[PDB]
């Protein structure tokens, strides 16, 4: 167990509660397995490491030098999900599969934690909680991706959008390519 | 993968971000391992099953007939943590170890989910998200335990306190023995 610098990845399915309230069991399985397959493949392709699944949430980590990969991974997941919704009919529940991604950067305590009854690899630090809250912050944001200033520290490639300070407080950033093209739940209930 | 009725357990350390901001690495490890050891032992003692660790959060599940155990498990964790803080000096960081527990009941999709690169046992349903939000709901509540009406459905044993409807909306319940004996973060910063 030691203190290491890492980049934390958090992503989940938007309006997943309403999706599990109206879709049958076989369709929820297909939709979640589709989301897990797209996320883990793109994360692993850029050297990322998927740590664990929590319901519909995907947690991954990148090394301190892989800020370029964490952004490219997020953009590739968003683009592949947008191509998925366009290649299916409007009545297909896959047409409602959106995501929200949060990235953070900072020191975290990495090591095996727990007791004799349960030992598990764990990441402890502010960067883990910040990445989860920025991921949930994208639900009220027009961009499916949000990261801190530590992930941005990759300037020559993307047009970084400064969304300002949010809940102490931190600064939130995003990219223009992460723009989303509430009304999701209304789109789900009307279609299904 | 099938639809099963379960009781979901979620618990974390209160003000864990401020604790990781002021305590050294060796002390955070001791505090988290203490919390994991107390939780997993009491959960396993009542037949519960600790599913996974997420930072400082502990996720567990009980069968549909173990609503009596999920409440007793929560009360035993609260009592053992209260006895821990009284058997240590006020300067000991273990004197600041509090918890918040959320319980839920409902149908969840149980089965192995993911892709070929990552397969993991997963629980999908409203009961998983509700238990996590009731656990976070205890931070603004005077009780370290909060559960839905499905967990309460065990009437002859506890004096159930009806806290009313909260965020659709659900009803929240607790017990008088879960009373806590914001000021936590102020207690942490002054002591440390």
């Amino acid at each position: 167990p030691q203190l290491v610098e890492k980049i934390i990845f958090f992503s989940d399915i938007l309006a997943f509660s309403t999706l599990t309230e109206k879709l049958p069991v076989n369709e929820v399985v297909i939709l979640v397995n589709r989301y897990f397959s797209i996320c883990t493949r793109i994360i692993s392709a850029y050297g990322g490491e998927v740590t664990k699944f929590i319901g519909d949430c995907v947690m991954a980590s990148f090394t301190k030098e892989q800020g370029d990969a964490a952004i490219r991974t997020s953009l590739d997941i968003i683009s592949e999900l947008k191509q998925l919704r366009h290649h299916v009919e409007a009545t297909n529940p896959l047409h409602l599969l959106y995501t929200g991604i949060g990235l953070s950067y900072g020191h975290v305590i990495e090591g095996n934690m727990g007791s004799s009854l349960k030992m598990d690899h764990t990441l402890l630090g502010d960067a883990v909680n910040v990445a989860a809250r920025l991921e949930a912050l994208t639900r009220q944001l027009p961009y499916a991706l949000a990261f801190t200033a530590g992930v941005k520290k990759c300037q020559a490639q993307w047009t970084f959008i400064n969304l300002g300070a949010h809940q102490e407080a931190i600064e939130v950033y995003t990219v223009n390519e992460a723009q989303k093209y509430l009304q999701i739940t209304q789109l789900i209930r009307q279609t299904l």
Side-chain angles (χ1 to χ4, degrees), chain A:
Chain A
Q2 274 285 5
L3 191 74
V4 297
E5 292 177 286
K6 276 181 177 177
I7 296 160
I8 306 303
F9 177 93
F10 268 101
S11 68
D12 62 335
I13 301 177
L14 299 182
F16 182 69
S17 176
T18 312
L19 287 163
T20 56
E21 250 175 85
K22 306 302 298 176
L23 291 179
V25 176
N26 60 314
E27 189 62 33
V28 175
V29 168
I30 295 177
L31 189 128
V32 173
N33 282 334
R34 175 66 58 189
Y35 183 77
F36 285 171
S37 179
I38 294 180
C39 289
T40 58
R41 167 174 49 86
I42 299 181
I43 291 173
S44 303
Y46 285 97
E49 294 186 284
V50 176
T51 56
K52 50 191 60 181
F53 297 149
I54 301 93
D56 66 319
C57 185
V58 175
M59 184 186 177
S61 64
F62 292 77
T63 66
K64 68 169 301 180
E65 316 284 359
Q66 290 172 343
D68 44 320
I71 298 181
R72 292 178 186 176
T73 293
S74 302
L75 296 183
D76 286 20
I77 293 176
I78 295 176
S79 60
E80 281 198 32
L81 285 178
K82 283 192 277 208
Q83 294 177 340
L84 168 64
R85 301 192 292 270
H86 290 340
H87 282 151
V88 300
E89 292 152 299
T91 180
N92 196 315
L94 290 173
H95 193 67
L96 312 167
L97 184 53
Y98 292 79
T99 190
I101 300 180
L103 309 177
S104 68
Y105 172 84
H107 307 76
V108 291
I109 299 180
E110 157 182 89
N112 189 9
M113 312 259 72
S115 172
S116 303
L117 303 185
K118 269 289 298 181
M119 288 292 273
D120 182 25
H121 187 265
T122 315
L123 293 179
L124 300 169
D126 271 15
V128 181
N129 168 260
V130 165
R133 289 176 175 174
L134 296 189
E135 166 256 272
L137 203 68
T138 60
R139 184 177 61 89
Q140 64 180 15
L141 285 177
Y143 307 91
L145 173 59
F147 41 88
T148 57
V151 186
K152 156 190 163 299
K153 75 171 186 178
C154 306
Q155 176 58 224
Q157 162 72 342
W158 286 288
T159 309
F160 288 97
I161 297 181
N162 197 339
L163 299 181
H166 294 81
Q167 176 269 338
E168 36 181 321
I170 65 169
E171 197 87 341
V172 183
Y173 291 87
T174 185
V175 295
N176 193 97
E177 298 82 87
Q179 183 184 346
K180 305 175 182 177
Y181 310 114
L182 174 59
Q183 290 176 340
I184 292 299
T185 66
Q186 305 173 181
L187 183 69
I188 293 175
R189 292 187 291 100
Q190 179 166 259
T191 52
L192 276 309

